[PDB]
Amino acid sequence: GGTVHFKGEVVNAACAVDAGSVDQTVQLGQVRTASLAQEGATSSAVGFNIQLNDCDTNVASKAAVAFLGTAIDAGHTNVLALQSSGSATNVGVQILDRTGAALTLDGATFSSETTLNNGTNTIPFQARYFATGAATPGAANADATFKVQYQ
């Protein structure tokens, strides 16, 4: 059972990041080697949310999220590498925003801007496997951190 673990920062800003959202794990399901048999193959995406509380739209009207993690290789900068352990090979984890596109993982590429209401707001995401070749079985755990940008 593969996972991706997210950790954010608790910081004073226009909103307060929810204490559940700031440290969470997403379950990606078993790695099906046959359905990830060639570069570009993807698994079925799994949803997760980053919830923001007590937002004040006089301070910021929009929010976006940037993720940081090890890119699986230079040719796939929007695919997270897996933790070492034997771990699965030729497969990593992607993070998608509401546009459906996978995000670059360098801490400076922000997701689709989301217009805030006062109070609580949810920014929805998805995670999935992305094959860089013929995947091989093994543990599939990834990690990323995130930061919220307000405008």
Numbering used by the authors: 7 to 91, 94 to 159
Source paper text:
FimAECO, FimASHI, and FimASAL were produced as reduced, insoluble proteins in the E. coli cytoplasm without their N-terminal signal sequences. All proteins were refolded in the absence of the chaperone FimC under oxidizing conditions to allow the formation of the single, invariant structural disulfide bond. The purified proteins were crystallized, and their X-ray structures were determined at 1.5, 0.89, and 1.69 Å resolution, respectively. In contrast to the intermolecular donor strand complementation (antiparallel to the FimA F-strand) observed for the assembled E. coli pilus rod, where the FimA side chains of Gly8, Val10, Phe12, Gly14, and Val16 from the donor strand occupy the binding pockets P1–P5 of the FimA-fold, the reversed (parallel) donor strand orientation in X-ray structure of self-complemented FimAECO showed the side chain occupancies P1/Gly14, P2/Phe12, P3/Val10, and P4/Gly8 (amino acid numbering according to E. coli FimA).
In the structure of the pilus rod, the FimA subunits interact via inter-molecular donor strand complementation, in which the N-terminal extension of each subunit, termed the donor strand, inserts as a β-strand into the preceding subunit and completes its IG-like fold. In 2010, Sukumaran et al. discovered that the FimA proteins from the enteroinvasive pathogens E. coli, Shigella flexneri, and Salmonella enterica have a second function besides formation of homopolymeric pilus rods; soluble forms of FimA, independent of FimC, act as inhibitors of host cell apoptosis after pathogen internalization by stabilizing the interaction between hexokinase and the voltage-dependent anion channel (VDAC) on the surface of mitochondria. We showed that all three FimA orthologues investigated (FimAECO, FimASHI, and FimASAL) were capable of folding to an alternative, self-complemented, monomeric form of only marginal thermodynamic stability that likely represents the FimA species that acts as an inhibitor of host cell apoptosis after internalization of the respective pathogen.
